[PDB]
Design a protein around this ligand. Structure first.
Ligand SMILES: OC[C@H]1O[C@@H](O[C@H]2[C@H](O)[C@@H](O)[C@H](O[C@H]3[C@H](O)[C@@H](O)[C@H](O[C@H]4[C@H](O)[C@@H](O)[C@H](O)O[C@@H]4CO)O[C@@H]3CO)O[C@@H]2CO)[C@H](O)[C@@H](O)[C@@H]1O
Ligand code: NAG
Ligand code: CL
Ligand code: CU
Length: 235
């Protein structure tokens, strides 16, 4: 159970974004129905008033929280991968428009899942803004908690993969547009019961054998990281 408070740009807090530049749900309940419109931008997808100004090469840091800002972020039980997708605001999330900018499942070195490191990072994880057409975008951050993904939601609606999904409104001003955004996958649509990473037993199987749901990270992605980039407590 977790939500996005707002974003930092190049280590500068853009202030509370909830229902402002983040299309926030009314609460931190998970999305589990793979075929639902709710897979797009969660249970309350609608144009909100603001869109954060950024440029290609900026570091965009999403900040997640549980109850209060900078609390315990998400429950330690919610082991799983983190992904960021991008779509043109044009789409409003509809059609084959989502391009993956980032994927992080399990780090063998430190033996931590993306979610484990997100708790350590005070809920902060980042992507580098890619060289797409200047304009308005949604950045869709997705946490998959697998603490019950041993079942499918479609077969047992009290278990299944949990999706914590948050769309930020981002305006990309300066960009040479060296990497025009390709067509992407739909949500709902790209994740089905057979798709790998959706059904997995983290209790019986080792985390090194885990394989995140596709699609693959676009070649035009300039990567990203899970790490604190600023102190929320100094505000
Ligand atoms: O731990 C392995 C075990 O996990 C079982 O699943 C547990 C989760 O581990 C546990 O973390 C989860 O806790 C939920 C709780 O069910 C929610 O009701 C609660 O929701 C709160 C919310 O946290 C508040 O932020 C908000 O203000 O109010 C709501 C209202 O209820 O949130 C917590 C997580 O923070 O409970 C699960 C029980 O299913 C698996 O079933 C089992 O297979 C695993 O072995
Ligand atoms: C899942 O979502 C679809 C599409 O909105 C809906 O028709 C269906 O009732 C939901 N499935 C379950 C298991 O509730
Ligand atoms: Cl839960
Ligand atoms: Cu939860």
């Amino acid at each position: 159970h977790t939500l996005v408070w707002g974003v930092w740009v190049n280590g500068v807090d853009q202030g509370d974004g909830r229902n402002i530049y983040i299309r926030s749900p009314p609460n931190n309940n998970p999305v589990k129905n793979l075929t639902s419109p709710d897979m797009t931008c969660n249970v309350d997808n609608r144009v909100v008033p603001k869109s954060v100004p950024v440029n290609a090469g900026d570091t965009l840091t999403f900040e997640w929280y549980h109850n209060t800002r900078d609390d315990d972020i998400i429950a330690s039980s919610h082991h799983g991968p983190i992904a960021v997708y991008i779509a043109p605001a044009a789409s409003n999330g509809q059609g084959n428009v989502w391009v993956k900018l980032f994927e992080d499942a399990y780090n063998v070195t430190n033996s931590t899942w993306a979610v484990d490191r997100l708790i350590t990072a005070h809920g902060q994880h980042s992507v580098v803004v890619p060289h797409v057409a200047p304009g308005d975008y949604l950045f869709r951050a997705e946490i998959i908690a697998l603490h019950e993904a041993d079942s499918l939601y479609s077969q047992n609606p009290i278990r299944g993969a949990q999706f914590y999904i948050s769309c930020a409104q981002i305006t990309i001003n300066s960009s040479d547009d060296s990497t025009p955004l390709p067509a992407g996958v739909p949500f709902p649509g790209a994740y089905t019961d057979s798709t790998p990473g959706i059904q997995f037993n983290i209790y019986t199987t080792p985390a090194t054998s885990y394989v995140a749901p596709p699609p693959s990270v676009w070649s035009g992605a300039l990567g990203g990281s899970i790490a604190q980039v600023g102190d929320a407590s100094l505000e």
